[PDB]
């Protein structure tokens, strides 16, 4: 490894590049992961015996885990880079993605 707390595992890349047809857009943020459910899976439900009606009844579990959601555009496109996309092009689709955690403390 030869890494240790002495170093920074990763660098900050918020850069986006327009190359031919490809456009490669990366981001980075800062996240704070709170402890959830004192580490207990829990059954959660909402009954129709309460004020809830039959449409709002659900059943399931709430886990201590948590998940990264980048699924929205405005994550990955600065309002300028989204202007170069909608003004100059007919269509766009993704090819590959890449994902990194670093500098975890």
């Amino acid at each position: 490894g030869a890494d240790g707390v002495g170093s920074s595992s990763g660098n900050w890349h918020c850069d986006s590049t327009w190359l031919g047809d490809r456009v490669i857009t990366t981001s980075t943020r800062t996240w704070a992961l709170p402890t959830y459910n004192n580490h207990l899976y829990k059954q959660i439900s909402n009954g129709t015996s309460g004020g809830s009606t039959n449409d709002n009844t659900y059943f399931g579990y709430s886990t201590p885990w948590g998940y990264f959601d980048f699924n929205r555009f405005h994550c990955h496109f600065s309002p300028r880079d989204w202007q170069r996309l909608i003004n100059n092009n007919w269509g766009f689709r993704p090819k590959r993605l890449n994902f990194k955690l670093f500098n975890i403390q």
């Binding site: 600065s78 309002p79 300028r80 202007q83 003004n87």
Partner: protein, 104 residues
């Protein structure tokens, strides 16, 4: 140049063109004067020109959107920059070259 556009120390060379004058019937008896009777004439043809431009590509980190030249979204009696009922091509307004922004 004050009007704008690229000043050139050797501009594109201008082109001059003329019909070759074709004289009408000269007299039977020679005379000194030049021929003053010409055959009315005019010519037509197709002229083509390309100008190969170099574009300076734009790389800018400005966050918020730029300003852009955009056509009117509201309905109009006839399309701008395009012919009207009479067949008359009409450019409605002048179009500047400056929109994108840069740091002084």
């Amino acid at each position: 140049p004050l009007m704008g556009g690229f000043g050139l120390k050797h501009p594109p060379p201008q082109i001059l063109i003329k019909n070759t004058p074709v004289p009408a019937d000269p007299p039977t008896t020679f005379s000194q004067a030049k021929l003053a009777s010409f055959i009315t004439q005019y010519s037509t043809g197709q002229v083509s020109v390309e100008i190969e431009w170099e574009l300076q590509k734009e790389n800018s980190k400005r966050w918020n959107p730029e300003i852009q030249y955009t056509s009117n979204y509201y309905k109009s009696t006839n399309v701008d920059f395009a012919v009207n009922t009479e067949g008359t091509y009409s450019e409605p307004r002048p179009i500047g070259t400056r929109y994108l922004t840069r740091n002084l």
